[PDB]
Amino acid sequence: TRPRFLEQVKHECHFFNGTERVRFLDRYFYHQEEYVRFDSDVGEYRAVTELGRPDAEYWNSQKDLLEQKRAAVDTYCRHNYGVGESFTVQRRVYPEVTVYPALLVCSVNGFYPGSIEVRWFRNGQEEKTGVVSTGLIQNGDWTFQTLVMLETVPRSGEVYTCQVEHPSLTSPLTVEWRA
Amino acid sequence: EHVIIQAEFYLNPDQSGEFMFDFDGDEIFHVDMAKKETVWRLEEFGRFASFEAQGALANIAVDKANLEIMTKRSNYTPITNVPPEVTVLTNSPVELREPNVLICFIDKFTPPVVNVTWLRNGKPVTTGVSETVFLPREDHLFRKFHYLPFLPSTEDVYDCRVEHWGLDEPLLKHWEF
């Protein structure tokens, strides 16, 4: 029952087009409320709320740490990006695609990164209507999954194809299911 | 495109903290403050990079210091409990006798404290379980994953039991084949 008090700190590096445009943010929070932050595009600490006022003024008076934060985009952001690039930015895990009835379901699992494209085809033609997706689901272990269902109006001998496009592949991945 | 976040937090009166690196929503690693070592989310990450775990403690000590100060400035205003929404799903499509993983996803909640228990046919399961630490969200609440490897069977039923001060009573998310 004892009331809780939480302090959170988030040092973020945002990358646009590789490392050409980098934005650094030094954020502080009391519970879930951000009270002070340093922004690369500003060059100083600004109080987000009155509780941060004393900090923004005191920290900005210290020319030693402002120098440090103003160089963060290079010494911290770009440096770390280079160190982790091979296993984060360039991580490629191909997906596993499964097609099963009961309405047709196309399950795409264990892929990374999240950018993917799943399409349903009926006799060589792409299906637009009767297609529902669950969206991108994170498993928490650096893999994603997604299910794309197709409302099916049965027929004799027609073939259904689930086509998947993903960065880890050379060409689209396919799975054909015939009744 | 991409975001790399070094996330930290200290909690009173539990006197516990966390220090982790996040890449586009996934944990690269977190620091075990008692063993003073770097715990990579995936083993292989350790073969490509390194991190001086002890450095994390310096940041955590400073975090507690700021907390002490903010606790007073705010006139001892405590945190407001936000109950988590729980989802239970599987790692891949289910097929009898084929290894799979049950995922209990706990989302949108604070403070970062939860009791998660897996139940098979109403009874506690602790063997083979693993979990992630608290992951940060953009709204500054938290996420957390708990796993249970299992062999799909028609005679077993599972429940993910979550306890959180934002809930009047334990929440139970059920799953069955």
Binding site: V9, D26, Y28, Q68 | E8, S50, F51, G55, V62
Partner: peptide
């Protein structure tokens, strides 16, 4: 990797 210091 380099750490950024909390202040």
């Amino acid at each position: 990797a380099r750490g950024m210091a909390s202040v």
